[PDB]
């Protein structure tokens, strides 16, 4: 498990996340722009860079019960994401790095 393609490719989760601010649900989006929407909606700081804290917030998350992941499990997941995607060893994940995998 990790930053799988289907986890980002869930149109329903993206649509239910963009509600309130982006009020235009359309069930015809390509699998390209929805990954982008994921990247924009999970960058809370507005710096256009995904770091470990934002990724862990996305992975743990709260949707309405569900049990929480263990701290060691979350550490392993984020470390596996960073060790295989942060080519520039900055800690942050650029959109190009995100699109690579």
């Amino acid at each position: 498990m990790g930053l799988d393609k289907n986890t980002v490719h869930d149109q329903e989760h993206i649509m239910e996340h963009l509600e309130g601010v982006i009020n235009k649900p359309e069930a015809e989006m390509s699998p390209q722009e929805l990954q982008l929407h994921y990247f924009k909606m999970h960058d809370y700081d507005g710096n256009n860079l995904l770091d470990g804290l934002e990724l862990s917030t996305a992975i743990t998350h709260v949707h309405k019960q569900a049990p929480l992941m263990s701290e060691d499990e979350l550490i392993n997941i984020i470390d596996g994401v960073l060790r295989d995607d942060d080519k520039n060893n900055d800690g942050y994940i650029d959109y190009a790095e995100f699109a690579k995998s």
């Binding site: 809370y44 770091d51 470990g52 743990t60 709260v62 929480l68 960073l82 080519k87 800690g91 699109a99």
Partner: protein, 325 residues
Amino acid sequence: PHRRFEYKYSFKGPHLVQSDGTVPFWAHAGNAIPSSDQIRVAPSLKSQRGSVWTKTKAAFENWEVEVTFRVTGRGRIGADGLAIWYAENQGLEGPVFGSADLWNGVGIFFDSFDNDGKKNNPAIVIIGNNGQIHYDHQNDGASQALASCQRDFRNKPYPVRAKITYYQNTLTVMINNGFTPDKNDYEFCAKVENMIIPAQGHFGISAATGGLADDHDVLSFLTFQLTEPGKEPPTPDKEISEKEKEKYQEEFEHFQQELDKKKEEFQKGHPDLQGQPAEEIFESVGDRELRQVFEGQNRIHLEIKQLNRQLDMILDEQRRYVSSL
């Protein structure tokens, strides 16, 4: 130098706490109240102590830590103050700014109360202890203070940001005074050369409240690993020809433009956000003491006006009791 963000030693908003009410990768003890936007290390109550330490030890040769905090108090005199530690053991409880004495590491103390009576406070005091020197609370630690600078960080319109950088055995503390909302206006405060610290230690931040009361919020705590430009391995041939980076950057920018346009043209379609400007959230302390005085007059006027109208009737009806008779 080269900076790498370390997620295992950081916390930031707006999702600071999880659904179980704990800060990820951090252990909080004492009177700390972690909320989603900030961690209130010590609220505005008498005799409060709080601390948040890292769960896992950090092994960095050179590092940099950026802390955003607010110390807000009603009066002009505050107590006790804030502290940022890089220690060997997690001392989450004690008498030194809400954490234990006799620590094996380095400690930066934001002292708001001048116990020494020398008018040298508020101050930023760097204290490095091997584990055998007690903190002289009655003299603000001036005897064992490695370095100090005299700054004010209480009741500012914007959060105060501090950068503490350990690089080539020199510890540099830079303070953003918080007058401006810019996040990159740091001004130099202090430095200590040939500073020695343990190779592996726990980051932490604590706060304590004495006779006076202040609120010690911490909004973010960003930890960066600093590597020398020459010792860092380049590891080339990993950019995958760098063409897709340029091919994706303009697509990302085009999205940013489109989403900004969509937000712009749907932010006014159904205007329901009340909003909260910073002008409505900031007010000077002394000016506050003026405003209440003004309110004290707004009562007194009424007690005249009614009285005035009372005298009015004694002018009118008495005439009706004069001409009739």
